[PDB]
Amino acid sequence: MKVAVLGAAGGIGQALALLLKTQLPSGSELSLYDIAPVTPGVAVDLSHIPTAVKIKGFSGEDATPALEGADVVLISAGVARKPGMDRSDLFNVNAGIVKNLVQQVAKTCPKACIGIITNPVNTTVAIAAEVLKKAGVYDKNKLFGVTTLDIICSNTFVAELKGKQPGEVEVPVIGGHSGVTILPLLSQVPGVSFTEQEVADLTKRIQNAGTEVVEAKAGGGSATLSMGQAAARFGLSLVRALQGEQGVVECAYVEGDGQYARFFSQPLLLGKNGVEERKSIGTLSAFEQNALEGMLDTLKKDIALGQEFVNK
Amino acid sequence: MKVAVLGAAGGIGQALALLLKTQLPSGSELSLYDIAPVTPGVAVDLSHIPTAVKIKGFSGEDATPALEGADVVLISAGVARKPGMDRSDLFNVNAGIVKNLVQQVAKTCPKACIGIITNPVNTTVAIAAEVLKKAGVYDKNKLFGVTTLDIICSNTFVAELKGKQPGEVEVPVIGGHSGVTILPLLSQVPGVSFTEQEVADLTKRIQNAGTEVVEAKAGGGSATLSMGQAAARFGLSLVRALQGEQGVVECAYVEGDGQYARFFSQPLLLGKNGVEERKSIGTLSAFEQNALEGMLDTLKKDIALGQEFVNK
Ligand SMILES: NC(=O)c1ccc[n+]([C@@H]2O[C@H](COP(=O)([O-])OP(=O)(O)OC[C@H]3O[C@@H](n4cnc5c(N)ncnc54)[C@H](O)[C@@H]3O)[C@@H](O)[C@H]2O)c1
């Protein structure tokens, strides 16, 4: 099976391509693509690592050469926030490239699962959906917003706080991928019970994790490595399910039953064709219930903004 | 165990910290250091990955807080080469950085094992030694020049050629870490046989693998991801050995018996005190015999340079 990374030259893309080179299954194929002229050399550098994963790099305006026969297309192209900005600012910046990149996909590998990393996810996914719809090949079970970073961050904070082994904690995270739209279902963390203030303090910390990294890098980029690792966990999950592994569950922003919004991140059962079943968000706590409602308007706005950009 | 990465904000440094954060044994501590102000931000980014490895970053002029208690110190600091340059050409821009870093290691954690990644390793390892000898704390079982990257490139090219599974091949490589001092013992590869010609092409390819990447990145930088992977393997081998594991063997550049030069790279058994035993380079073919000879001049020359730089 072939995986294609769009935006492989940036900080997130390189960390991701490194992880995938070293962790995809023997026999997999990985093609990298980016406008950056360094791109082909990023592949040559990775080609030197001794794993049964064939790698190739392409530069240019045409991504087409690395989308041929692609099964999974991970999109991390774009740019990221510096100190001050939010996640609803570089909009025209990236939305454009997402728009462009999603188009080449539709023409070249419509039936592949597409994972969107480029922020702001809430909006960029909607834009990709509209482009896929417009081109007449949209498969709503094959378009996901990679929100995995919010999951691994919540795992880490819950572990440290409660003194648990970090690999043994998995917290479900629902909603969206930015600020208020990010909701940790802490009431559902087995074996651990929290106090209202911990839930409050933790939720805040989890929602502001990205800012924590920006202020620390003092305007030297945002999270790139952990983002890389997370995108890496998600790509492998997608790849495992596509190969028939059963029981693969990941929360991800997708087009659902519209119960809360056209797009919403909830627990997903993945299978040979992408989303196999959209799990329920389960029983919420008063706090989660409270928080779930107050972010709605914000979420559909992002979605809105996304739809607009394409249809007009 | 505590691992200190010096020069952590560069491309090698960051790819290396990413791999070590997810791969060191639970319980380990990872310290990052670079003069670049972004460094502490890099650690915070990595601190978001849920593994039981505590990580912190430090910036500034003084590496002291990074070095307190380190058991392993990896030095990837310094400038990489530009298209056209050679590994020898980096001596001037890197000698002082190495000198400064190693002195702080000497004052703060003299017992730690030191891995010099900074090129030209043939020369920078010699500088480090003299510096340690002058601080009066040099342990030749504790100072190594990381050449692991020549190994993994060798296992890759050999596998692609002979149709073997990359993970099953281990070609040993001795000499030094440069265009003509890198000698792969293709004759000792258990299982495969090569033709006069094959050995000829493979050998050149392995020796210029570094340039292959610099050229391919067209000025963007040299091997950084394959290099981060190689230094990670080496660092994992060292740590497993410091912990008591047996049978740990890695080729590295160190002060040996002197049979070929003050420093030479050969198979080394690693143990709880650093280099445990330097294994014999074994059986050489006609060709390998020629190579080994052809290069000694350059090597002693390369070492001579690092020495007078500290002495003179
Ligand atoms: N052993 C090998 O196989 C091998 C392979 C490639 C490169 N290298 C060498 O490793 C070094 C690293 O290259 P790179 O690709 O990461 O380059 P890079 O330019 O991308 O990063 C180098 C980093 O060194 C840091 N640095 C410089 N002086 C410092 C000091 N005094 N204290 C702390 N940090 C300092 C810089 O801030 C920078 O982040 C170079 O000397 C390169 O030639 C080794």
H-helix or E-strand spanning residue A48: none
Do B168 and B140 fall within a single domain?
no
Which DSSP symbol is given to B118?
Answer: S
B280/B174 same-domain check:
yes
- Mutation target vs A (from B48, B207, B214; most A CBs, 10 A cutoff): B48
| Catalytic residue annotation of A | 177
The token pair that represents B224 in the structure block: 């950084």
Closest CA to B207 of B174, B235, B236, B231: B174
List residues near ligand 1 (CB under 6 A).
B 6-7, 9-13, 34-36, 76-81, 90, 94, 97, 100, 117-119, 121, 146, 149, 177, 221-224, 227
Q: For the domain that residue A136 is a member of, what is the CATH number?
A: 3.40.50.720
A164 with A235, same domain: the answer is: yes
What letters, b where the CB count within 10 A reaches 16 and e where it falls short, cover B287-302?
bbeebbeebeebbbeb
Instruction: Evaluate whether A91 touches A97 at the Cβ level (below 8 Å).
Output: no
Q: Which two tokens stand for residue A72?
A: 């999974």
Same domain, residue pair A60 and A137: yes
Assess whether A30 and A47 both reside in one domain. Answer: yes
Contact residues, B window 192-221, toward A, CB-based 8 Å cutoff: 209, 212-221
Of A25, A26, A40, A47, the C-alpha closest to B156 is A47
Q: Are residues B1 and B133 in the same domain?
A: yes
Q: For residue A295, which phi and psi values (nearest 5 degrees)?
A: -105, -20
Note the resolution in Å, 1 decimal. Answer: 2.1
Last residue of a domain, one of B108, B126, B146: B146
- Report the structure determination method: X-ray
The answer to whether residues A125 and A162 belong to one domain is: no
B4 CA distance to ligand 1 centroid (A)? 15
Domain final position from B81, B114, B146? B146
A280 and A270 share one domain: yes
**Residues in contact with A244: Cβ distance below 8 Å, sequence separation at least 6, in sequence order:** A272
By the CB < 8 Å criterion, does B238 face chain A? Answer: no
Annotate B155-180 with DSSP letters as a single string: HHHHHHHHT--GGG----EEE-SSTT
Q: Check whether residue A116 and residue A206 sit in a common domain.
A: no
Is residue A278 classed as helix, strand or coil in its secondary structure? strand
A311 CB-contact burial (10 Å; exposed 0-12 / middle 13-18 / buried 19+)? exposed
Written as one letter, the residue type at A309 is: F
In this structure, are residues A250 and A161 in contact, taking their beta carbons and an 8 Å threshold? no
The reply to whether B312 and B302 lie within a common domain is yes
Residues spanned by the domain of B26:
1-146
As a whole number of Å, the end-to-end CA separation of chain A is 37
CATH of the domain at B197: 3.90.110.10
Question: Is the four-CA dihedral B293, B295, B297, B302 of positive or negative sign?
Answer: negative
Breaks in chain B listed by the residue before each, with C–N > 2.5 Å = none
- CB of A155 within 8 Å of a chain B CB? The answer is yes
Phi, psi of B126, deg, nearest 5: -60, -40
